[PDB]
């Protein structure tokens, strides 16, 4: 039904079986590997200590930014217990969104701290580093319950 972009096939199950050209990659994140690994480790060890998922979004928010962020949070696995940080570098906009279960655990005192750290580190031009700093601060703020 879809495009199946030149190498993909729909199998006897719903799984797609894609391919890659012999020299190219299959990820294409415009950040260094030792940046992505530090972000992954921060994101994992903050969640393990706060007992809540942490999520990061970098695409556009070409609408009401808060409304778009709250529509985005719906795609996190367990959205009721999750904290999301969305950033638009085109609109220079930052948003943080909460969940129903993660409430009263130390969050309202941590979201502006995280926004402040993220903005402060974006003022130099370090996107991944600002994300890491914000996630560290927020995860150190939140408490398990």
């Amino acid at each position: 039904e879809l495009d199946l972009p030149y190498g993909s096939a729909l199998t006897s199950s719903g799984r797609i079986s894609a391919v890659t050209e012999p020299g190219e990659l299959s990820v294409h994140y415009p950040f260094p590997t030792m940046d992505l690994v530090v972000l992954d480790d921060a994101l994992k060890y903050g969640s393990r200590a706060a007992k809540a998922r942490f999520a990061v979004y970098i695409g556009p928010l070409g609408a009401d930014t808060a409304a778009t962020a709250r529509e985005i949070l719906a795609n996190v696995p367990t959205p009721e217990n999750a904290v999301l940080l969305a950033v638009s570098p085109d609109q220079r906009a930052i948003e943080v969104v909460y969940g129903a279960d993660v409430k009263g655990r130390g969050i309202e005192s941590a979201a502006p701290l995280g926004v402040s750290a993220a903005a402060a580190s974006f003022k130099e031009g370090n996107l991944i580093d600002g994300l890491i700093s914000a996630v560290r601060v927020m995860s150190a703020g939140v408490s398990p319950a």
Binding site: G7, S8, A9, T11, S12, S13, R15, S17, A18, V19, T20, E21, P22, G23, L25, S26, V27, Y29, T33, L36, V37, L39, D40, L43, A55, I72, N75, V76, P77
Partner: protein, 552 residues
């Protein structure tokens, strides 16, 4: 809409994730990984022995080694390189990719699989642990000829451990061959006929048959030798035909062995060429027939290793070797026709396969020259034979093993090895090999026999030994890029989220997740040819494949 991923996949795995799984596992993927790692460790040990030998061979005179030590060195080098690296790396690759290629969830006997692995490991350790004896390790040749291996001559305890370790490893190999034959015969997808299975699978089948022919007779001969050494058993007594009896039995075992360590690597390059030429394999049934003919002929030439004894029927064996030289040429022509008129790209596996082609061609030419008894009458037991079998052995096992590692690392780990490090590795290996083993032809042509610990300055051949030692040190330093690459790329390194990271792949292993799940498959495609994954990923091509196939 959106999908939740991670910034980077997990690097290592939780604490306590491997050790107990390693002791209790029964899955062929992990067993093949263990095969590969231990075989490469043994390769490093054998290469260290070879470096010591080269260092002594330069600069006439005995600088730091003794005669006994040099003898132990070439004995153990040959033993390790031939029986602790190549024969088990064959079954490593088999356990890695044969069930995925026939479409099975498992091997036939998963506990016999692990038994074979552990038997290999402990037999190799038993045979190597002769160096800690005051007499040293075995110091007769790798061939262990007739009266030199009794208890009068060679009375130490290293040869005993050698014999028993070889027996244990041979039992492991026999069990592995039985397992592979049964797996290919019984377990097979519900549409895959025997003339739709890959050439690698065909070659593993044939190699297992040869294993079952060759190894039991070596076990019998070794038990006879142990009976002699421990009970005075008159079996290899030269008062009988005991001197030639040993040679006949040993070479009947030993030539099928050098073919056992060649056909799976022929199969490896036969899998690799079509993917990077974007074309079908040229002469599928012809390659199958050539494999079968080589296998049949390989058990009837054994005595071309006995030309200079004056006790063999020369024309029979000479004609048989001249005959066996032909299907290899047919196979070469099929490999050339596969690449002919394609769209060639040269990544690391393709580069290594082309290097294999060149090196093995030169080695096979020197061998077919070696098959003439009047020429062997001069060039036997010299460095010409050493250069020959190093060309053929290196070209097949080293180059095809590296090509297969670079090919199937994504399929077994989910990561990609680096390409610049791989190109550096390849060029270092190529230059070092051709620097170390080319001048040895001339070296042995002017009189210089093999297994010589020392020579004189008034003899010739002193600059050529220096050149060969330079080349050997290049070959030694060529392993650091590869080891660093594997060590870095296992944990870091580009992830693979698709099937078939090398586009245009075949053989049903590129139609599953890149790290395959336990039981290897969540679905199967319709099997109409020997390129089921190709027809699955490119359905607009099946018509154009059936149409223009028999043009020629």
């Amino acid at each position: 809409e959106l999908e939740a991923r991670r910034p980077f996949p997990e690097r290592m795995g939780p604490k306590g994730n491997l050790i107990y799984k390693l002791i209790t596992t029964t899955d062929h993927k992990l067993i093949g990984i263990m095969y590969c790692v231990v075989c490469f460790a043994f390769f490093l040990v054998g290469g260290l022995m070879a470096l010591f030998m080269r260092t002594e061979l330069a600069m006439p005179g005995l600088q730091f080694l003794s005669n006994e030590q040099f003898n132990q060195l070439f004995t153990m080098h040959g033993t390790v390189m031939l029986l602790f690296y190549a024969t088990p790396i064959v079954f490593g690759f088999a356990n890695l990719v044969l069930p995925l290629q026939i479409g099975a969830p498992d091997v036939a006997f998963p506990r016999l699989n692990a038994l074979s692995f552990w038997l290999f490991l402990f037999g190799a350790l038993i045979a190597i642990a002769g160096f800690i004896t005051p007499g040293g390790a075995a110091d007769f040749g790798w061939t262990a000829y007739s009266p030199l291996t009794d208890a009068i001559h060679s009375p130490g305890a290293g040869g005993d451990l050698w014999i028993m370790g070889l027996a244990v490893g041979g039992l492991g190999t026999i069990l592995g061959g039985v397992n592979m034959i049964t797996t290919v015969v019984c377990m097979r997808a519900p549409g895959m006929t025997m003339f739709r299975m890959p050439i690698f699978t065909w070659n593993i089948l044939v190699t297992s048959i040869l294993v079952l022919i060759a190894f039991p007779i070596l076990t019998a001969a070794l038990f006879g030798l142990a009976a002699d050494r421990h009970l005075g058993a008159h079996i290899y007594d030269p008062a009988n035909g005991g001197v030639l009896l040993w040679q006949h039995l040993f070479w009947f075992f030993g030539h099928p062995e050098v073919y056992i360590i060649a056909l799976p690597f022929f199969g490896i390059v036969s899998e690799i060429f079509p993917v990077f030429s974007r074309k079908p394999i040229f002469g599928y049934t012809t390659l199958i027939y050539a494999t079968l003919a080589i296998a049949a002929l390989s058990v009837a030439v054994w005595a071309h290793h006995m030309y200079a004894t004056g006790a063999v029927l020369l024309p029979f064996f000479s004609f048989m070797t001249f005959l066996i030289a032909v299907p290899t040429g047919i196979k070469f022509f099929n490999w050339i026709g596969t690449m002919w008129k394609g769209q060639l790209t040269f990544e690391t596996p393709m580069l290594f396969s082309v290097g294999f082609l060149i090196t093995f061609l030169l080695g096979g030419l020197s061998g077919v020259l070696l098959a003439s008894p009047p020429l062997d009458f001069h060039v036997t037991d010299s460095y010409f034979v050493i250069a020959h079998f190093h060309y053929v052995l290196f070209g097949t096992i080293v180059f095809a093993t590296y090509a297969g590692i670079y090919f199937w690392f994504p399929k077994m780990t989910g990561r990609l090895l680096d390409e610049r490090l791989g190109k550096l590795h390849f060029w270092l290996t190529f230059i070092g090999f051709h620097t170390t083993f080319l001048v040895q032809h001339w070296l042995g042509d002017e009189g210089m026999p093999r297994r010589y610990a020392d020579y004189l300055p008034t003899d010739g051949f002193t600059t050529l030994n220096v050149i060969s030692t330079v080349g050997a040190f290049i070959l030694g330093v060529s392993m650091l890029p590869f080891v660093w690459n594997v060590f870095k790329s296992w944990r870091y390194g580009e992830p693979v989220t698709v099937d078939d990271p090398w586009g245009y792949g075949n053989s049903l292993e590129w139609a599953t997740s890149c790290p395959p799940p336990r039981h290897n498959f969540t679905e199967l495609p319709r099997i109409r040819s020997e390129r089921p994954a190709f027809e699955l990923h490119y359905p607009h091509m099946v018509e154009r494949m059936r149409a223009e196939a028999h043009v020629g």
